[PDB]
């Protein structure tokens with residue numbers, strides 16, 4: 126099941142960058158195998174620097190479910206969530222995070238060096254409690270290739 | 283001026299908690315000396331756990347200026363911004379943050395221990411770039427008093 130939803134997140138990333146909504150990032154929020162929200166980065170479309178894929182999905186899922194906690198839901202992120210997004214995942218009380226590519230894969234094509242200490246377990250003040258799964262196998266390889274694929278698609282533009 | 287805009291962020295904190303929009307937290311974004319956004323926590327009003335005062339203010343300022351970066355603006359927060367909000371402040375590229383109450387003041391009234399390493403200078407992977415000012419004196423007194431004053435609210 127993890128492979129299904131992670132690949133849905135990756136496809137959101139491709140769709141969002143293709144239509145110009147934002148960068149190549151996707152996120153899917155799922156409640157007992159039912160998809161609650163399927164989003165990509167909307168920073169450009171919304172003129173909102175907080176509209177990352179994860180934040181957008183959280184906003185949508187909370188509005189759909191009429192509550193500010195998503196404690197029975199899980200989130201699939203095509204890329205490792207940044208500090209803002211990991212903070213939003215913490216605040217939302219999501220029970221599990223599965224992510225596809227390490228942040229280094231995005232930094233490799235020029236994205237900002239902007240990594241969540243609490244995700245990687247390197248903080249003094251901020252600690253995480255939720256279950257975190259870095260994908261492996263086919264899902265991880267597919268997720269990691271998003272960034273070189275996007276850079277190649279826009280190389281001569 | 284620093285006192286003026288921090289006091290306005292505290293005023294937003296009180297207004298928001300009084301009308302049930304969210305918790306006792308406010309934020310003000312200014313371009314030199316003009317208010318670009320003045321907001322409070324809207325978590326309850328919007329059913330949105332990301333709608334902290336700072337995030338709400340960033341979104342409104344970016345809409346007002348029609349752009350996703352706020353490198354000419356500064357942000358005043360009634361309370362120390364949390365990891366989410368400090369991340370948002372980084373992404374928006376605000377050039378300066380002034381905040382009134384240390385997170386311990388909110389925690390002492392029963393809010394979650396949820397503190398940004400990058401703001402306190404203890405981040406390993408996340409390093410702040412912007413200038414940060416913790417208020418002192420009367421500004422700190424005003425911002426700390428919010429939590430005692432709104433305890434039963």
Ligand SMILES: [Zn+2]
Pocket residue numbers: 177178179206207208209210211
């Ligand atoms: Zn993010």
Ligand SMILES: [Zn+2]
Pocket residue numbers: 334335336363364365366367368
């Ligand atoms: Zn916050």
